[PDB]
Amino acid sequence: ALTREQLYIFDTTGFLVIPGVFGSGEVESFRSELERLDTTRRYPDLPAASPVFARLALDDRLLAPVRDVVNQPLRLLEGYGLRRTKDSVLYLHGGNSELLDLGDRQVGRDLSITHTYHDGKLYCPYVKALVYLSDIQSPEDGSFCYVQGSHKANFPLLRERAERGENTSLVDSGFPTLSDVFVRSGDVLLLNEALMHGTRRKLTEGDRLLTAFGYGPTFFTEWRELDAETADLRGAGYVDHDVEEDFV
Amino acid sequence: PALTREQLYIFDTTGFLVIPGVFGSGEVESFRSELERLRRYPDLPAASPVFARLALDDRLLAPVRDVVNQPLRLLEGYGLRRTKDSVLYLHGGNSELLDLGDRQVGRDLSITHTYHDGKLYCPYVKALVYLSDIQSPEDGSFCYVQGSHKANFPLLRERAERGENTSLVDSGFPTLSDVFVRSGDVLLLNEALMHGTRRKLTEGDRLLTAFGYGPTFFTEWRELDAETADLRGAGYVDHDVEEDFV
Amino acid sequence: PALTREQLYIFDTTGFLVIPGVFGSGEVESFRSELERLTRRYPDLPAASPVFARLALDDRLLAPVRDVVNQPLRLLEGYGLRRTKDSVLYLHGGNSELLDLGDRQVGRDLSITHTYHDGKLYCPYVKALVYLSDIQSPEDGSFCYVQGSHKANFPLLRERAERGENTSLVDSGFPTLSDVFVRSGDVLLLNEALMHGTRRKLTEGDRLLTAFGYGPTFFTEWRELDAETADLRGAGYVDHDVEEDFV
Amino acid sequence: PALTREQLYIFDTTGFLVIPGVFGSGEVESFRSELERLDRRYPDLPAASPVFARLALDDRLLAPVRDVVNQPLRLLEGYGLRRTKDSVLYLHGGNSELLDLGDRQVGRDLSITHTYHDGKLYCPYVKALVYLSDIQSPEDGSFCYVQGSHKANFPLLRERAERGENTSLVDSGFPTLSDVFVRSGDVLLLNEALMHGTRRKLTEGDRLLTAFGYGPTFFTEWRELDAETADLRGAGYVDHDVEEDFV
Predict the structure, then answer these.
(1) What CATH number is given for C1-247 in this structure?
(2) Quick one: how many helices (H) and strands (E) in chain B?
(3) Which residues of chain B lie closer than 8 angstroms to D147, CB-CB?
């Protein structure tokens, strides 16, 4: 379903913007399920709290590109909505080689995002399809931003900034290889979660709505943050590596 | 209890590592006794606080940590009795194929391991605690295809399509090798390895316990036939195994 | 003059690194002047002048080069470049571009196949471009590159050839094709795995630069080769799909 | 003589491949005869003999070599070998062995650093060993190697040297050191990234073989180099830790 050129772009940049996937007849229907669920927040577990979103998660407009970059037996790992309002922000997280202190060691791989390629197919264990439900067209409007090539980085970036005592986020201060991505309502942004990315500080009025769905292999557990391994090793979850929220 | 440099070299290069004399005679007999109190024995730590302790013993955890290097989760833990004429055909292999029903894939992300800055990173490893000696092929020895854990080419798909009826475990292969162990030994295994067991011909019974470990985001081990209609089905879809055509 | 953590991170992630103001304008003019002793390409500079022979070994070039090759070093080429109005350099390089070896197609060029191991980059072929004049807009013929093409797993150019395209992306534009602006006396350290080229220079004037390629000691000095010789004795570099093949 | 699927699997997984019965016993006899006319190592056999020059280009060597290099090909090496009683070759090679460059330590040797891509192996330096006599026991001076050492991520030999070891693994043994047994007329196809050597020959009577080394057209012909030279002009191969450094 993805062209050769699309695949080349997702592989080299770590994400792909697919224009105009949903006509604003469906977009409105999606926002209405979001207004309706209000009875600057995050709308958790959408597929369980709405039949309209349970259907979206399984939509071939989402599954088809996802299969093309995961190429494993698939499992829906998460689905949530987002309302980004004025002054909201999201610092950088992700990145292929960020460090994590375990008890005895430091590790530089996060296998939940560690991706490869073999015989014409990408194999990314964790990707996210962001369905945009309103336009985002400048940095100050709170645009998706990313560190170029960070999904294939061999070096850690953030640990050094922490021991230097840096206290500002790169999405504020800027970085030579930090880049923004502008989208339209109804666009899909297919994302390799190994990419180090975040969101500019929204300075403009008027809310910003998006839904996101996370897919991975059938042997991955549904997304749940975990702070460390459990005392008896029975517990499931995702332990993150160095993120800017740790020190900014 | 932590692996030496030479031990790590051997695990990386061959896909496994036999660790001698981990558990004493008394401990083995304790494990034997407990196993008898309860042919596969699924979910050991559940039904035996003796085996629950075993699963978290540092003599297993410290070497496992050195080849996984992630926050750990216990994925499976089972006991095993092998009788005469029992055989496990070949399964695993880094590049075996799998048809997804609209494409053909050559990686299994549940065993796809890597290496980075001085540390191995294997997402699925298994610790075999042997409770009896296995010292010859006819004893039903552990066997494996050399370097099969970092193979780039599939091996079994072609043999299915060429119509082979028999297992390499029986017929042999130029790189098929056996492993011999004593009671008390641990066999630390990368599940990317293509392995199985020799058909046991001798009498008596072989006993062992096995503990599978992976990162905390791996689901506990269970067979899945395929991905499900609602993308909610969880578990492990295997790739081409000899059971599929032998 | 080794590379910071950050510079290493940028080179590895983008396939190149601009190192601002390495040589003062006194040294630039001395480089400028020497090149006028002779559009145009001026090959084997280290031979033709003691100034460039000295530049090829300047620790300000060798120190960053060593950090990205991390092998016993050999100087493989050194050349000058005078770029005039309407000169253009179509895209070449790229990690997974195809090559017909006759009986088969191959997708790795082992002369630019790079890796990473225990905290070090191992890039077998890197260039250091020393700029002798400003390039601050695309119309001035700026260096341009396809983002992340130094680690691409698919070919970009073969499908474009087979589909009939007759235009360079350098002129066409392409979504992930971007420009690099430099200042006189800046160095651009380049992983030759990057698919790169230059914008067509539309402005009057001459931009001058010199370029030095480095690799391991078992690499032969750069020399173009069309194919393997019949007696397997011919040495040199066979390229894969480049845009000059069909534009 | 195209390598089958299983042969490629075996070569990829073990770093070598024995191809049985490539040359007839008369061809073998011709080669043996040609080696004694040239009367230990026999350097540059192709320059010495149009018989070995033709062997080097023989398709029964080039076809399997192309299947594991998959680059524009160059003949880098061609020598004869006379193995006598008490001769031994200590371990050399290995994918991750250390080398000290003078201001740093490195763990990749790009001359043997191999990869795989879209159904093809890409080994930059492979050897085809043509045996002119049977070697059927370790005491006969058999080829031996460390298992999976062509894809090793850790160094083996540094720790051994630093710990003050005196003996080579080809003598003392090692848990994963294995032997290869061959018939005259067999070819051994070898990824030079494999850590290998030969057992100490205890049996009587010379054994003979010829070896040809192949790599891409930009590799320089084989020659040892002790280090990178001050003027960056030195060409050849600097080895990493080998057992003859401390044994």
Answers:
(1) 2.60.120.620
(2) 6, 14
(3) 13-14, 146-147
